[PDB]
Design a protein around this ligand. Structure first.
Ligand SMILES: Cc1cc2nc3c(=O)[nH]c(=O)nc-3n(C[C@H](O)[C@H](O)[C@H](O)COP(=O)(O)O)c2cc1C
Ligand SMILES: Cc1cc2nc3c(=O)[nH]c(=O)nc-3n(C[C@H](O)[C@H](O)[C@H](O)COP(=O)(O)O)c2cc1C
Ligand SMILES: COc1cc(S(=O)(=O)O)c(C)cc1/N=N/c1c(O)ccc2cc(S(=O)(=O)O)ccc12
Ligand SMILES: COc1cc(S(=O)(=O)O)c(C)cc1/N=N/c1c(O)ccc2cc(S(=O)(=O)O)ccc12
Lengths: 202, 201
């Protein structure tokens, strides 16, 4: 009855990382609420994920490319698509970096959002092929953006996950960390309160 | 006259529609009497490094004697000096999985820089790039104008505004993968946006 949780960490701050700190605190809170978790942990920061270019996009679509480096990336694309389809809970660390997600997290979506694999084109809108997967997004920010137009990370993550079928996303925000005194403490405290709510639905 | 910095980011190569419409936009400007000097960048081919811990530290001004790091520090210097000396920034940014192409985001990750293009002050960090507008070329396989699924638009407005580029125009080619003539109506629409936006010099 153990949950299958795929953990994607994309911060570059190493040990100092807050989205990764809040991911761990969120994981323990799930255990502290009676959940046995099976974790596949991917530090996207240190995996050197490949970038999507014209040759790689064709092998991901079908074309024969007997390049050792391109054959290896399609293998990585398949394993990542396999892990995501096999899990119950996708937990994404998405700190705001220059008003976008971190590049390595974007590279993951580039290798995981694939036609015939995670979605398929319908006469109307693409249909997702990932079934029964929840998404919880940790996202610490410098200033505060949730609600306003300058927040691009939030509507981005919703659209790209929904394209693949994950129409269940829940955000743990930690905005306002640039204000040295209260700002950091309040945003973290708000996230830790959001954590305690989200660590219950199992 | 106008100093233009054209940024191409599509991966389709010579079949790229954004690159075609970037050209169609620049020719229509010369038709309206605008003689541009161009710095041209196909970010697909320059293999821009990814933002990581040591590079960000070096880009922030820290002493980082690492060789490969120092080169990307120079790549940020040169990429910013072009932008600061420009009059018109033209961006090709088609929707790639509801974000922008990765090779574009890496340029922003190198051009959005503290004590260079933006400065933190009490309240919101203020911009440091003066005299620059922006025209974004963005084609999409589906209809995303005005919807929540469009993050390219609010991201580009936000990240260009962060460094001071406030006037940003958008040229859209929506629903290019429709059964009847979605590719046609989308391009013809963007061409109607070509003719309007090419005038203001
Ligand atoms: C490279 C970099 C870029 C950032 N860009 C933004 C930004 O555009 N807007 C913002 O509000 N905060 C920005 N921040 C602040 C982060 O959101 C904040 O540091 C957050 O805690 C990072 O979480 P992490 O340590 O898990 O990466 C940026 C931080 C870094 C390191
Ligand atoms: C890798 C890739 C991802 C794409 N993702 C989207 C998408 O998420 N939504 C959409 O409407 N169209 C998407 N498209 C279709 C493009 O928007 C369309 O093909 C556009 O005209 C590409 O222009 P370009 O040749 O300059 O790259 C995608 C195309 C590619 C190649
Ligand atoms: C582009 O960068 C930023 C953009 C904006 S905004 O667009 O106006 O919203 C804001 C409000 C802040 C930003 N600075 N971000 C950091 C950074 O660049 C480096 C180290 C940091 C260390 C910490 S901290 O954890 O040690 O406290 C916190 C933040 C940063
Ligand atoms: C996540 O990917 C997508 C999401 C959506 S969405 O859910 O509705 O937002 C849509 C509508 C299309 C998408 N991908 N489409 C292409 C693609 O994957 C590869 C090559 C293409 C070449 C051309 S073309 O210009 O040469 O005809 C056109 C489209 C593609």
């Amino acid at each position: 009855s153990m949950a299958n949780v795929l953990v994607l960490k994309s911060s570059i701050n190493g040990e100092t990382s807050l989205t990764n700190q809040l991911i761990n605190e969120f994981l323990a809170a799930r255990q502290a609420a009676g959940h046995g978790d099976r974790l596949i942990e991917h530090d996207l920061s240190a995996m050197a994920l490949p970038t999507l270019d014209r040759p790689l996009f064709a092998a991901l679509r079908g074309a024969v490319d007997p390049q050792p480096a391109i054959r290896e990336a399609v293998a990585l694309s398949d394993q990542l698509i396999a892990e995501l389809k096999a899990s119950d809970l996708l937990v994404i660390g998405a700190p705001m970096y220059n008003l976008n997600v971190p590049t390595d997290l974007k590279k993951w979506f580039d290798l995981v959002a694939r036609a015939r694999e995670t979605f398929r084109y319908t006469e109307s809108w693409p249909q997702g092929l990932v079934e029964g997967v929840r998404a919880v997004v940790v996202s610490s920010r410098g200033g505060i953006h949730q609600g306003e137009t300058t927040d691009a990370v939030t509507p981005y993550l919703r659209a790209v996950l929904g394209l693949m079928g994950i129409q269940e996303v829940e955000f743990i925000y930690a905005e306002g960390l640039d204000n040295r005194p209260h700002g950091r403490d309040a945003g973290i405290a708000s996230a830790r309160a959001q954590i305690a709510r989200l660590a219950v639905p199992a």
